[PDB]
Swiss-Prot record, chain A:
Signal peptide: none annotated. Coiled coil: none annotated. Changing W51G: No effect. Slower growth and thermosensitivity. Complete loss of function. Complete loss of function. Residues 1-59, 62-107 form the HTH myb-type domain. Transmembrane segments: none annotated. Present with 784 molecules/cell in log phase SD medium. Involved in pre-mRNA splicing and cell cycle control. Required for the binding of the NTC complex (or PRP19-associated complex) components to the spliceosome to mediate conformational rearrangement or to stabilize the structure of the spliceosome after U4 snRNA dissociation, which leads to spliceosome maturation. Its absence leads to an arrest of the cell cycle, possibly due to the inefficient splicing of TUB1. Belongs to the CEF1 family. This is Pre-mRNA-splicing factor CEF1. Changing W83G: No effect. Slower growth and thermosensitivity. Complete loss of function. Complete loss of function. It is found in: Cytoplasm; Nucleus. The chain holds residues 2 to 253 of 590 of the full protein. It comes from Saccharomyces cerevisiae (strain ATCC 204508 / S288c). Residues 32-55, 83-105 bind DNA.
Swiss-Prot record, chain B:
GO terms for biological process: generation of catalytic spliceosome for second transesterification step; mRNA splicing, via spliceosome. This is Pre-mRNA-processing protein 45. It is found in: Nucleus. The keyword Secreted does not apply. Its main location: nucleus. The chain holds residues 56 to 163 of 379 of the full protein. Belongs to the CWC complex (or CEF1-associated complex), a spliceosome sub-complex reminiscent of a late-stage spliceosome composed of the U2, U5 and U6 snRNAs and at least BUD13, BUD31, BRR2, CDC40, CEF1, CLF1, CUS1, CWC2, CWC15, CWC21, CWC22, CWC23, CWC24, CWC25, CWC27, ECM2, HSH155, IST3, ISY1, LEA1, MSL1, NTC20, PRP8, PRP9, PRP11, PRP19, PRP21, PRP22, PRP45, PRP46, SLU7, SMB1, SMD1, SMD2, SMD3, SMX2, SMX3, SNT309, SNU114, SPP2, SYF1, SYF2, RSE1 and YJU2. Interacts with CLF1, PRP22 and PRP46. Interacts with SPP382. Belongs to the SNW family. Involved in pre-mRNA splicing. Associated with the spliceosome throughout the splicing reactions, until after the second catalytic step. Present with 1670 molecules/cell in log phase SD medium. It comes from the Eukaryota. GO terms for cellular component: nucleus; post-mRNA release spliceosomal complex; Prp19 complex; U2-type catalytic step 1 spliceosome; U2-type catalytic step 2 spliceosome. It comes from Saccharomyces cerevisiae (strain ATCC 204508 / S288c) (Baker's yeast). The gene is PRP45. The keyword Cell membrane does not apply. Keywords: mRNA processing, mRNA splicing, Nucleus, Spliceosome.
From Swiss-Prot, chain C:
This is Pre-mRNA-splicing factor CLF1. The gene is CLF1. Belongs to the NTC complex (or PRP19-associated complex), composed of at least CEF1, CLF1, ISY1, NTC20, SNT309, SYF1, SYF2, and PRP19. It comes from the Eukaryota. Belongs to the crooked-neck family. The chain holds residues 78 to 153 of 687 of the full protein. The lineage of its organism: Eukaryota, Fungi, Dikarya, Ascomycota, Saccharomycotina. Involved in pre-mRNA splicing and cell cycle progression. Required for the spliceosome assembly by promoting the functional integration of the U4/U6.U5 tri-snRNP particle into the U1-, U2-dependent pre-spliceosome. Also recruits PRP19 to the spliceosome, as a component of the NTC complex (or PRP19-associated complex). The association of the NTC complex to the spliceosome mediates conformational rearrangement or stabilizes the structure of the spliceosome after U4 snRNA dissociation, which leads to spliceosome maturation. Present with 2140 molecules/cell in log phase SD medium. It is found in: Nucleus.
From Swiss-Prot, chain E:
The MPN (JAB/Mov34) domain has structural similarity with deubiquitinating enzymes, but lacks the residues that would bind the catalytic metal ion. Contains a region with structural similarity to reverse transcriptase, presenting the classical thumb, fingers and palm architecture, but lacks enzyme activity, since the essential metal-binding residues are not conserved. The chain holds residues 532 to 580 of 2413 of the full protein. This is Pre-mRNA-splicing factor 8. The gene is PRP8. Functions as a scaffold that mediates the ordered assembly of spliceosomal proteins and snRNAs. Required for association of BRR2 with the spliceosomal U5 snRNP, and the subsequent assembly of the U4/U6-U5 tri-snRNP complex. Functions as a scaffold that positions spliceosomal U2, U5 and U6 snRNAs at splice sites on pre-mRNA substrates, so that splicing can occur. Interacts with both the 5' and the 3' splice site, as well as the branch region. Has a role in branch site-3' splice site selection. Associates with the branch site-3' splice 3'-exon region. Also has a role in cell cycle. Present with 468 molecules/cell in log phase SD medium. It comes from Saccharomyces cerevisiae (strain ATCC 204508 / S288c) (Baker's yeast). It comes from the Eukaryota. It is found in: Nucleus. The lineage of its organism: Eukaryota, Fungi, Dikarya, Ascomycota, Saccharomycotina.
Length: 238, 93, 76, 101, 49
């Protein structure tokens, strides 16, 4: 129901630059197809060009100093029109270098495809938005939200369902207790032959290896306190 | 000092006897009939006095031997009262 | 759950994995003291300072506890 | 002053607790040779004060951490995040990178 | 076969039937060969089933 966009080179707007930035923060630099899937009407290579040429904060967009500018005239003299090598020598993007070289030596129609669109300035947007851009930001927030797998999401669901299942299981017992028939709570079943129930025994009980001092009366005081707590939970209910 | 030539012999003989008892038991519990050609070779008094005679029984070769034997998972209680001390002495990273 | 025997067994099983860990020793001493079981904690502080004698905080813990009960001969 | 060791923080904690014990004070031994056990005759009071002291101190430290959690959860002026745990991770990165260089 | 001899073991040599005989559990008789074959078929079916 969208007709297919076969050629996806366009003009970079503001929306796509900002979604590319908030996608590179989460997805990282070397996954480009997963970045460019987040914003339609652009390609994984054109996302890579828009990062490495324009949106990168390491890139040097300032005015040229006088030593920089004389260095540019000399390097453009020595290396004839090898602009990637020159731009590597200046730590500046190559499009900046070419346009500033044109400004030194000086002293698009409609219906054309612009090849240099990734290196050029963005277009700010009309005031409300377009509808497809509303859809783009909605699905982009939806894909930047999730940090879980299938197993973990199913675990969230299973914990909630077991919780509500226990609540219903206690509800019926409280109703039958009001009626006067005391159904004891059934236990979960063991999945294997030596699966351990944890109210029968202290399961790996380690005694504290007695010393020189005497602990009879403190034992009696603890035993009194615990017996009284269990009786109070039986009568009054915590 | 180095340990004397007699204690080396006493220790070697006692521990050799122990290792041979363990090896004979491990080769005698095996199901291989061929292992018992590699082994290298009672009365006890149950009270103040009773004089019993401990005999072994001759078992069926087809029925399983060591009928209590089975593969189980066991935890062991790690129990000590030897406290032993740990005898130590007194932004860049 | 006001069940002190299971808490003691759990702290002992916790010490068997890692005896080098000081906040576990301090919680188990405090968990004895807050329920007013002073002799259990005396046995425990003994076992702590005799296990790790080069640790300063354990001796000072046992000195605080014997000061707070006013036992000056024991602190000396 | 920087980071402090454990042998020094131990002494400062001991001295603060004794200072507390002095202001709180402002406001035998029997060996049974049958078993070998020592019964020390301690008063019931000063045990209750020790227990209530430890309980009140743990509650005080607990409430201080609880209030620090909310006052560190209000301030959003660090960085952009997507959940409650990313905010703590990004504040950790700010604390390391501000101190380092 | 002639290139590699496999050279039997002439010591201890526990044999099977000579040690299955010393038990009280085995006994001994003579029967026709075809009866022994049919009994072995019944026994070997019963074991695997």
């Amino acid at each position: 129901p969208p007709v297919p966009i076969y050629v996806k080179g366009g003009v970079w707007t503001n929306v796509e630059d900002q979604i590319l930035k908030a996608a590179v923060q989460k997805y990282g630099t070397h996954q480009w197809s997963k970045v460019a899937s987040l914003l339609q009407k652009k390609t994984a290579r054109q996302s890579e060009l828009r990062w490495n040429e324009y949106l990168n904060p390491k890139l040097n967009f300032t005015e040229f100093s006088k030593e920089e500018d004389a260095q540019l005239l000399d390097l453009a003299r020595e290396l004839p029109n090898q602009w990637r090598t020159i731009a590597d020598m200046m730590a500046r993007p190559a499009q900046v270098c070419v346009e500033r070289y044109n400004r030194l030596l000086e002293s698009l129609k409609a219906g054309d495809i612009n090849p240099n669109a990734e290196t050029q300035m963005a277009r700010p947007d009309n005031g409300d938005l377009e509808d497809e851009e509303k859809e783009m930001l909605a699905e982009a927030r939806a894909r930047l939200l999730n940090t879980q797998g299938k197993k973990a999401t199913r675990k969230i669901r299973e914990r909630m369902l077991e919780e509500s299942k226990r609540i219903a299981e206690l509800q019926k017992r409280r109703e039958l207790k009001q009626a006067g028939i005391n159904v004891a709570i059934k236990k979960p079943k063991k999945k294997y032959g030596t699966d351990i129930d944890y109210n029968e025994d202290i399961v790996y009980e380690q005694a504290p290896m007695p010393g020189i001092y005497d602990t009879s009366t403190e034992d009696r005081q603890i035993k009194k306190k615990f017996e009284q707590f269990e009786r109070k939970v039986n009568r009054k209910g915590l | 000092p180095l340990p004397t030539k007699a204690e080396i012999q006493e220790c070697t003989a006692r521990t050799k006897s122990y290792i041979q008892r363990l090896v004979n038991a491990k080769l005698a519990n095996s199901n291989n009939r061929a292992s018992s050609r590699y082994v290298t070779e009672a009365n006890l008094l149950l009270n103040n006095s009773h004089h019993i005679e401990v005999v072994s029984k001759q078992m069926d070769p087809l029925l399983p031997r060591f009928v209590g034997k089975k593969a189980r998972k066991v935890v062991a209680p790690t129990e000590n009262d030897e406290v032993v001390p740990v005898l130590h002495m007194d932004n860049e990273w | 759950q006001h069940d002190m025997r299971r808490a003691r067994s759990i702290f002992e099983r916790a010490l068997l994995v890692d005896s080098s860990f000081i906040p576990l020793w301090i919680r188990y001493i405090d968990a004895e003291l807050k329920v007013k079981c002073i002799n259990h904690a005396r046995n425990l502080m003994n076992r702590a300072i005799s296990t790790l004698p080069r640790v300063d905080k354990l001796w000072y813990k046992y000195l605080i506890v014997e000061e707070s009960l006013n036992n000056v001969e024991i602190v000396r | 002053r920087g980071g402090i060791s454990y042998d020094q923080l131990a002494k400062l904690s001991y001295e603060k607790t004794l200072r507390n014990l002095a202001t709180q004070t402002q406001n035998k031994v029997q060996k049974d040779t049958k078993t070998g056990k020592i019964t020390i005759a301690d008063d019931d009071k000063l045990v209750n004060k020790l227990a209530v002291s430890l309980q009140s101190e743990s509650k005080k430290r607990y409430e201080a951490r609880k209030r620090q959690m909310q006052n560190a959860k209000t301030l959003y002026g660090v960085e952009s995040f997507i959940n409650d745990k990313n905010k703590q991770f990004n504040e950790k990165l700010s604390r390391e990178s501000k101190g380092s260089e | 076969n002639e290139l590699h001899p496999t050279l039997p073991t002439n010591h201890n040599k526990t044999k099977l039937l000579k040690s299955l005989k010393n038990t009280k559990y085995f006994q001994q008789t003579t029967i026709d060969w075809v009866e022994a074959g049919l009994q072995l078929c019944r026994q070997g079916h019963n074991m695997l089933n």
